Amino acid sequence: MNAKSFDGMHKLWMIMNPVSTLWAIFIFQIFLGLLIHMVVLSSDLNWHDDQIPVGYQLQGETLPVNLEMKAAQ
């Protein structure tokens, strides 16, 4: 068979505790979420510091008011 072979699957919860399993799954998912976000942020795919669509620190350094104040010094 290939369709009836997963029939008694629902009995899984007669040997595994449902509440413990739920908590374990949730905690593991949160840990993995944090980990994958940190792994992708540490690569060329980083999206906070890529200066797209614009660089904001650089934008602040070249405002006309800041430039005119830095010239007077």
Partner 1 sequence: KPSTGLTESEAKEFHGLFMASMTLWFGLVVLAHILSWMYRPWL
Partner 2 sequence: EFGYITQYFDLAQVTLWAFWLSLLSVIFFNRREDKREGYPQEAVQIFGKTILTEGFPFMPAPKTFKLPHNGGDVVKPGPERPQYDFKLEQVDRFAGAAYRPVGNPMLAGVGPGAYAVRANKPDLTNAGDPRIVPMRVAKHFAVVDKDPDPRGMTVIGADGQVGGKVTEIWVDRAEPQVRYLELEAGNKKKVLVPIALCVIKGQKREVKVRSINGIHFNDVPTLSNYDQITLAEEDKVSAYYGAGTLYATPNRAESVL
Partner 3 sequence: STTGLTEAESKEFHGIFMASMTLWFGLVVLAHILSWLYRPWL
Ligand X SMILES: COC(C)(C)CCC/C(C)=C/C=C/C(C)=C/C=C/C(C)=C/C=C\C=C(C)\C=C\C=C(C)\C=C\C=C(/C)CCCC(C)(C)OC
Contacts with ligand BCL by CB under 6 A lie at 26, 29-30, 33, 36, 40, 45, 47
Q: Is residue 35 part of the contact set for partner 2 (CB under 8 A)?
A: yes
Contact in structure between 51 and 58 (CB atoms under 8 Å): yes
Contact in structure between 34 and 28 (CB atoms under 8 Å): no
4 vs 11 by CB, closer to ligand X: 11
CB neighbours of 40 closer than 8 A, spacing ≥ 6?
46
Q: Is residue 51 part of the contact set for partner 3 (CB under 8 A)?
A: no
- Applying CB under 8 A, among 8, 53, 60, 64 the residue interacting with partner 1 is 53
